[PDB]
Paper text:
The Hermes DNA transposon is a member of the eukaryotic hAT superfamily, and its transposase forms a ring-shaped tetramer of dimers. The Hermes transposase is composed of 612 amino acids and is organized in four domains. Architecturally, the Hermes transposase is unusual as it spontaneously forms a ring-shaped tetramer of dimers. All hAT transposases are predicted to contain an N-terminal BED zinc-finger domain organized around a conserved CCHH or CCHC motif that coordinates Zn2+13, but no structural information is available for Hermes as the constructs used in previous structural work lacked the first 78 amino acids.
Numbering used by the authors:
A (entry chain G): 78 to 383
B (entry chain E): 4 to 460, 517 to 609
Write the structure that this text describes.
Amino acid sequence: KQSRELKTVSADCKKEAIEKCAQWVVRDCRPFSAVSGSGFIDMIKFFIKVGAEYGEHVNVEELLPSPITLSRKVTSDAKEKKALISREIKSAVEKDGASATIDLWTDNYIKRNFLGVTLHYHENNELRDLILGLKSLDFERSTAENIYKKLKAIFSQFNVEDLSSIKFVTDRGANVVKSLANNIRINCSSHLLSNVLENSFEETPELNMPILACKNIVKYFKKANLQHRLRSSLKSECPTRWNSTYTMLRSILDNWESVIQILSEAGETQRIVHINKSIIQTMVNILDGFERIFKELQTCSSPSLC
Amino acid sequence: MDNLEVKAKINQGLYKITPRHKGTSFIWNVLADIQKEDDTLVEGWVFCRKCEKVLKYTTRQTSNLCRHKCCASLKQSRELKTVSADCKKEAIEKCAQWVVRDCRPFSAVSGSGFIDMIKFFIKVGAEYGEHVNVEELLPSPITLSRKVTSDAKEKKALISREIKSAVEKDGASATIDLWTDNYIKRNFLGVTLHYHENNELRDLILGLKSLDFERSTAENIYKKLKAIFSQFNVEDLSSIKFVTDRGANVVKSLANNIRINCSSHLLSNVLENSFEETPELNMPILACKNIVKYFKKANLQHRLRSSLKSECPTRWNSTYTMLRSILDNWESVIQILSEAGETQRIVHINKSIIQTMVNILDGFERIFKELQTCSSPSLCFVVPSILKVKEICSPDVGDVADIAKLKVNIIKNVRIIWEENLSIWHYTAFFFYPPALHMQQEKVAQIKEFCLSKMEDPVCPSDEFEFYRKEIVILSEDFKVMEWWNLNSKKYPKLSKLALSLLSIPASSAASERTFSLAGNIITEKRNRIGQQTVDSLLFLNSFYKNFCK
DNA sequence: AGAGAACAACAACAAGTGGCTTATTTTGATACTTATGCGCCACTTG
DNA sequence: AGAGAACAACAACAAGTGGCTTATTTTGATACTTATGCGCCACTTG
DNA sequence: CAAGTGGCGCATAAGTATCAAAATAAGCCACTTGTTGTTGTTCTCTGGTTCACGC
DNA sequence: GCGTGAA
Ligand SMILES: [Zn+2]
């Protein structure tokens, strides 16, 4: 028990420590998992070190800065770290090995347009990934020329002048297509397969009718607050998110007994019984195969091109 | 040289002095400057108050001025032992890693609880050296939840005695409300409590318990509130003053007890009725609504210099700030509409009516702000609100006849909505105003026997009531009624408790709105599995720390 | 061839001052870049 | 396809009083050698 | 006379010893409340809004 | 010109 190593404390210290932690958590309205932060324990290390080395009569308030200082410091560190890393960035991109995915996104509240850039490349027995930056296209309407200028500006402030050897795996955005016509443009496999599935469903209206029935049933569930007695609540109807209807099918067919029991006295049981379960499990298995394909192929931490 | 010249002139007395500069540093608490004979400040040089030597002044830097011998001795108040610049550098560095690695807001470091934690941690580190294992010291969130629940239980047990002590003296003002969350569709029941013990009202929440998922009904509300009061072992449940506006099932449940309407939502409904009866002013508001939607649909908000406000969240008439934002930047928006091809929309609206409506609705906003105050008592200034809204809506020739129609609608709605729904308790509260020269009508006639009957539970009550009737002092700008009868409590030992109870009744029930907003802050899209017990415990602890602690 | 004890004529030495060129620090006003800090001021959000 | 956040359900647990036989140090005491001065006091000498 | 020593024990004492009857901790186990810990489950987040444009 | 879609 504490064989002369990094020392422990008594029970009073633990009690008062958790008292202080509870005080902070309840008073400042922060998430509970804060005390498990990776940087939080490092800050605790620094503070206990400083306190031990400088006694217990120091001005705690003065040692802690203001948020504006934090912003200036993080900006300065951003500039310094970018300058430090640009050398290895140019070294890696010079050797024809540099792969980057490009896609734009619109902000939810202010709707400012942005563009993000990352990099996938192999340093030493591993594929190193770091995001290069994320710059906004002001407020002007999006165009291929602006995207091309912004990307060359980012690569240039990171000391890149080739813009030919690097690789892109992106969408079929015609503006993006004309943006980088001098290099390769590879269609996103996930997006291609999503289009394939959309075409697959849309050519069979007879079997699309069960999908409409199921989505209107989950609408009936969410509209009347009927997920309360259900053992496992249902998910979103149609978010256009890589066949969320697959999860809908799994949930519906795992609570089929409960939903039929509920709808027997609800008067809508005639609608569900129109479709037999066998075809439903068959397409569930097909979507199981497709979901396995998704989870194996869609991976940024291991090779998947093979 | 210039300095010798100005020194000689000021010593001869040709130039005068100015000792204070309104600066945040301590150097100007001793240092001073000079002004010329034509009331012009001296630039580039300063003057000391003890050595009487003219030193240089620099706008870009003042460090050279603090090493002077006269200002050296003053320094500043002794502080706890400080460290060098390096330690601060590594401190801000580690704080930068903390704030970047956990996606946390920057203003987290300035929290009071964080300061308490760092004080504790620096103390324990100084006590037990530099080799203490930190990972065992920091607990896990499950322990945090268990301990906060237990602490909520024990704090409630401790305070229930003083809730009883407050309720026995008939001070039992507390409002209830219902609200729906955003993601679980659960319905939560919220209730606060107000009482006076230590010369200001105590704002705290009794609790917030969820009524499961079963269908809303009067019996569920009554049993829920009965249980909530039962955790404090309270069975009176009759002298509690209720403030709910138009909750139909809620009113039906508590119809046996004392019920009082809510003034804020009443006034909002009065404004709604007033604007409903004038279509000529109804369609310009709709035109402004469509104009705002036109900007918002195609994110045309970038061009404008001051973006428009939210349309109408049913959150106390946001159309005020909506029309303010529209009016105060009219030229730019009408230009944008000019090249937008939708120029026909603006023809229906004129600026003068906009500005007059801005004036009157800003008056209504001021009324809202004055009446809605949780900390200070606010029940007294209610009838003067009706008087002021009456006098502002004076039918004149300056306004258009349509504005006269709107004013007539306001007066009709306030006459047939507000005063007929006003309880005698509001009259009693208005009566205690120290200058009572305006009212000598039947209201005092009724309040006489009302107060005499209520206070049943030499030293004659009627005689001291007329003694209060004679004493009259006009209002001062910094006057408070509560401390006024705190001083007069010796003069009237029994009526003081009655007036304290009356002044403990809030004008409205905005406390429930504040609690619901706080709960919405607690429950976010990213935190949704949180339980009702934890929410209630957190809210109770926050309210207790804000109210009853230091 | 010891040994013990004490003057004597010189005689080779220090403790305690001034004179002094010639450096040898200390006190002090001031010309700048450069990393912190309140405080309105929003201000856009729902 | 990671992203944070958080319960419920069952294992798991150090923190604390009470029996207690087995080492073993404090105090105590009798018991006995070495050696260390204090003062008469002769006990001399010149 | 007086500065020097033995002497007569000589009353004292800082040393040593061993013979008893007590004052303590160590290793284990009792056992009863309260108390902390992984390891599961369950609900959202990003996939997306009109322009390059050829067909 | 208007899908044309692939976002
Ligand atoms: Zn001075």
